[PDB]
Design an enzyme around this catalytic site. Structure first.
Site, mmCIF file in Angstrom:
data_model
loop_
_atom_site.group_PDB
_atom_site.id
_atom_site.type_symbol
_atom_site.label_atom_id
_atom_site.label_comp_id
_atom_site.label_asym_id
_atom_site.label_seq_id
_atom_site.Cartn_x
_atom_site.Cartn_y
_atom_site.Cartn_z
ATOM 1 N N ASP C 217 0.836 -1.189 0.000
ATOM 2 C CA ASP C 217 0.000 0.000 0.000
ATOM 3 C C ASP C 217 0.885 1.259 0.000
ATOM 4 O O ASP C 217 2.070 1.161 0.281
ATOM 5 C CB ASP C 217 -0.891 0.041 1.236
ATOM 6 C CG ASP C 217 -0.146 0.049 2.566
ATOM 7 O OD1 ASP C 217 0.233 -1.050 3.038
ATOM 8 O OD2 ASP C 217 0.075 1.150 3.098
ATOM 9 N N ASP C 219 0.196 3.869 2.156
ATOM 10 C CA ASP C 219 -0.016 4.561 3.424
ATOM 11 C C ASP C 219 -1.234 5.472 3.287
ATOM 12 O O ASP C 219 -2.270 5.035 2.752
ATOM 13 C CB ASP C 219 1.247 5.225 3.964
ATOM 14 C CG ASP C 219 1.123 5.515 5.449
ATOM 15 O OD1 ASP C 219 0.632 4.619 6.125
ATOM 16 O OD2 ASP C 219 1.445 6.625 5.905
HETATM 17 C C1 LIG Z 1 -2.394 -6.918 7.991
HETATM 18 S S1 LIG Z 1 -2.538 -5.144 8.209
HETATM 19 C C2 LIG Z 1 -1.296 -4.841 9.469
HETATM 20 C C3 LIG Z 1 0.142 -5.033 9.071
HETATM 21 O O1 LIG Z 1 0.447 -4.125 8.002
HETATM 22 C C4 LIG Z 1 1.829 -3.798 8.011
HETATM 23 N N1 LIG Z 1 1.823 -2.539 7.248
HETATM 24 C C5 LIG Z 1 1.394 -2.482 5.941
HETATM 25 N N2 LIG Z 1 1.229 -1.276 5.475
HETATM 26 C C6 LIG Z 1 1.485 -0.459 6.571
HETATM 27 C C7 LIG Z 1 1.406 0.929 6.747
HETATM 28 N N3 LIG Z 1 1.067 1.810 5.781
HETATM 29 N N4 LIG Z 1 1.724 1.409 7.972
HETATM 30 C C8 LIG Z 1 2.058 0.557 8.941
HETATM 31 N N5 LIG Z 1 2.150 -0.768 8.885
HETATM 32 C C9 LIG Z 1 1.807 -1.227 7.681
HETATM 33 C C10 LIG Z 1 2.206 -3.772 9.498
HETATM 34 O O2 LIG Z 1 3.543 -4.190 9.738
HETATM 35 C C11 LIG Z 1 1.133 -4.662 10.186
HETATM 36 O O3 LIG Z 1 1.590 -5.827 10.882
#
Ligand SMILES: CSC[C@H]1O[C@@H](n2cnc3c(N)ncnc32)[C@H](O)[C@@H]1O
Ligand SMILES: CSC[C@H]1O[C@@H](n2cnc3c(N)ncnc32)[C@H](O)[C@@H]1O
Ligand SMILES: CSC[C@H]1O[C@@H](n2cnc3c(N)ncnc32)[C@H](O)[C@@H]1O
Lengths: 273, 273, 273
Positions: C217, C219
């Protein structure tokens, strides 16, 4: 409240950091146990005389450097010093430098800090029902800072007269990316692990607290990154200079801090609700 | 789950911050105990009527300001409000200003935050086995923000329509070096100690939460640094203006938040794995 | 110390993150319980063979994604892998991107990190009486990083060869104001929640640890902010590419890390006092 032996008092406290486990400086030393509501301080407090002034010495890491920064019982340490009656607290600390002109072997007397700790558990003595929010705009005791600077100058040592200390959690040292943030983004001067919450608690206890920092390394910015062995070696190599400064300054602390140059000396007057 | 007295419900919650310990505003007040899995909320919740709308009032610091920010049971507080059935939560908070034009006495309805707390112990309700990661890009409930702005304007008060709140750990106020980082580096507008994790938990509970902040001070940037007494004095001096805004806005909250203007109202749909 | 079944050993450890709960890759799998002084690891460790190399697989979140980042027993996890004899640890993680050219579906092999966690409770194995301060200027194992990059290139996947990972506490995602700080002020590249203190502990245990991150993604910077469901969906969609990379790289790890390209392989030599 209770001490063993009973009836012991002191006027100046010295908290020793890396490389400073024994007083060296005090005559007629007695080891003292001081009760606190928070359990054991880092070690026995050693109480003795330096030219007629009673001094309490506490190694923050304990004898033999047994206690890392995140595990120190900061509440017990400051409570114990307050209980013995001290008015002045000199902290001696090893720090890294984030700028070329603050060189290993130089002293720094910081005037500001930035707290980037996370795992110290208690950042105050006051958890209610009296809520206390001390002002720490100017967190160090100016009266003591000025005396430290003066002593260093008189003895011919390099003493940088200001500096922002960034306190990190540890125990690992910073990554290169972190160190760039501390240096280039926050514009900090020196870095260490032990200042917070020691300073917060000193302020709440209405003590005149200042740090005498010795630069031991340039963090991640030299051909060789900092290692623990390097820091220890540099402090032990220079401990004699720190001792000479303490002998010079302590006899001048026979009196009391000047209120106008002690930001925390009446901290609780405006801070408690 | 269990309340004493039994069967009590409310539609709007008001969390009072510094200077706001009693409802003032509610008719027919009953003090209610609400069971939570996390122990005691900050105090009894007071439930009563404001022009036909049932309101639950909770002082976050307890009556008499007995609980500092780091010691508040945020989980219990939000669980208790959710259990009574509230859909809207208005938080009233004292904040410092990091900019000249956000003056003491002005209201601010923030739209963003930066979390610089460290010691709040629980930042979520969800510790497993259902893992929940709520989106908080737009962390406040827009529907409620807009109503607060409108009320302030109608009553003739200054209400700044946006702002980034930096939440610090406390209980000590910021050093000058820290405050420069918040202002100049992070470009935050206002500063406080209580927003996090209150807002996180409100979002996870699918509540429409907004902050009505009152500027009480300019942090470390005036001739006089902030003190706790100053903050309390300014809030108590202005509490009547906060009360007038609540009386204006609460009757307009008879309905439900609009889904399209409530980022957390369906937070759990996409957040739970 | 004790394992059930007894006598099990492995050479390579794989820590699976979001979307990677089962090994898939190992032949002759046995589930192993490994005693630790810290209680349970996230799940059973699965031990099996990949082309003659013994591999230990641990899902950091447990099977079924039962354990969120802040609740993981990081100490138990790393202790368990060390106890089985592993020398290499590949972490597979989902990350967000803070830059346009690190696109969803791309791999990243980060070389730096910034720790913005707060609630992980233990950031080290060493609480005294031996004080340990490991250098982490270059926190990842270069030997393994280079092999990961090579594999990705050979297989024709996009692999970004550097990146600064900002580790946030969660479980909530960042606000817009926070994300602007990570991107514009700290100049971080990717963001996640699980790296710290996993990496700290791996370094202290003298393991060669590297992260293979998959961007899931952007963010808060796209028309749609990140949601948990999106992250999970993207990882599960791409898990086959991660599996192919593991099959390629693991057989090349039959030997030992090169000391000159493993910053933590002798971390304790200079770090312990
Ligand atoms: C399954 S959704 C949660 C996981 O997404 C990961 N992650 C993915 N995208 C982000 C993001 N934008 N910000 C923070 N963690 C993220 C993290 O390490 C967390 O364990
Ligand atoms: C004895 S090595 C550990 C000590 O070094 C001090 N210190 C010295 N240099 C640095 C540095 N570059 N970063 C952080 N702490 C440091 C810390 O306060 C800690 O207690
Ligand atoms: C009653 S004094 C303490 C309260 O002041 C609020 N506050 C007011 N001004 C500031 C400031 N400058 N910095 C931090 N918190 C502040 C905090 O949220 C806290 O609960």
């Amino acid at each position: 409240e209770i001490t063993r032996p009973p009836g012991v008092r002191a006027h100046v406290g010295v908290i020793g950091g890396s490389g400073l486990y024994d007083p060296g400086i005090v005559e007629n030393p007695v080891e003292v146990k001081v009760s606190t509501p928070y359990g054991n301080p880092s070690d026995f407090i050693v109480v003795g005389d330096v030219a007629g002034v009673k001094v309490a010495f506490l190694p923050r890491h304990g004898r033999g450097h047994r206690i890392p920064p995140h595990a120190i019982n900061y509440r017990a340490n400051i409570w114990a010093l307050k209980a013995l009656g001290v008015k002045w607290v000199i902290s001696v600390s090893a720090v890294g430098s984030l700028r070329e002109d603050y060189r290993p072997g130089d002293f720094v007397v910081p005037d500001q800090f930035i707290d980037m700790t996370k795992n110290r558990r208690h950042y105050t003595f006051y958890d209610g029902p009296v809520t206390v929010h001390v002002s720490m705009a100017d967190p160090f005791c100016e009266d003591l800072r000025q005396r430290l600077i003066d002593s260093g100058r008189r003895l011919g040592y390099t003493v940088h007269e200001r500096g922002t200390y960034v306190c990190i959690e540890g125990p690992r040292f910073s990554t290169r990316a972190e160190s760039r943030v501390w240096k280039d983004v926050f514009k900090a001067d020196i870095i260490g692990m032990t200042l917070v919450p020691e300073i917060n608690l000193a302020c709440e206890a209405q003590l005149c607290y200042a740090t005498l920092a010795m630069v031991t390394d340039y963090d991640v910015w030299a051909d060789r990154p900092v290692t623990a062995e390097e820091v220890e070696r540099v402090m032990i190599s220079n401990v004699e200079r720190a001792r000479r400064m303490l002998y010079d300054v302590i006899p001048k602390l026979a009196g009391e801090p000047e209120l106008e140059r002690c930001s925390c000396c009446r901290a609780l007057d405006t801070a408690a609700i």
